[PDB]
Design an enzyme around this catalytic site. Sequence first.
Site, short mmCIF file in Angstrom:
data_model
loop_
_atom_site.label_atom_id
_atom_site.label_comp_id
_atom_site.label_asym_id
_atom_site.label_seq_id
_atom_site.Cartn_x
_atom_site.Cartn_y
_atom_site.Cartn_z
CG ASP A 60 -13.48 8.27 -5.80
OD1 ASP A 60 -12.41 8.77 -5.41
OD2 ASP A 60 -14.11 7.40 -5.18
CG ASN A 78 -11.00 6.14 -0.34
OD1 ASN A 78 -12.19 6.43 -0.36
ND2 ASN A 78 -10.15 6.53 -1.28
CG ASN A 132 -8.41 7.07 -4.61
OD1 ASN A 132 -8.83 7.12 -3.48
ND2 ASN A 132 -7.33 6.40 -4.90
CG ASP A 137 -6.42 5.50 -1.35
OD1 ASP A 137 -7.60 5.51 -0.97
OD2 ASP A 137 -6.03 5.02 -2.42
CD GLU A 161 -3.06 -0.70 -0.06
OE1 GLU A 161 -2.99 0.40 -0.65
OE2 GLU A 161 -3.89 -1.59 -0.36
CB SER A 198 -11.92 9.46 -2.27
OG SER A 198 -11.41 8.37 -3.02
#
Length: 129
Positions: free
Chosen positions: A48, A59, A46, A52, A35, A50
């Site tokens: 969209d 998220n 991301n 992380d 990750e 959002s």
Amino acid sequence: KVFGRCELAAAMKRHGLDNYRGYSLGNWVCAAKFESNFNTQATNRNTDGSTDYGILQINSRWWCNDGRTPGSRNLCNIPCSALLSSDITASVNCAKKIVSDGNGMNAWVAWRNRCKGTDVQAWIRGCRL
Ligand code: NA
């Protein structure tokens, strides 16, 4: 903070992730490696809108508030910035809520694609725990 492999294994064990919801410590160390490359300050924006955050790339659509993910939830009841601390408490406590929902560690794409069905205990082998 950029953790060493055995350093993070020891910290995650101290913070209660070993066998949490039946996931051995190697699963958690493997997930953090792929990750974030063990970097607590890792972020990823991301498609969209959002983001992380942190060593387990948690998220903002569901788990934390970053003030720039409209119509999202904050199920860990934290600012997303808390997930970037050298102190892994907020990341660990939030990961415990995530893994307790329906899909377990499948919530982590890097775990599903790079850890699941592999020799995950290799990630903690040699470490003093
Ligand atoms: Na949010």
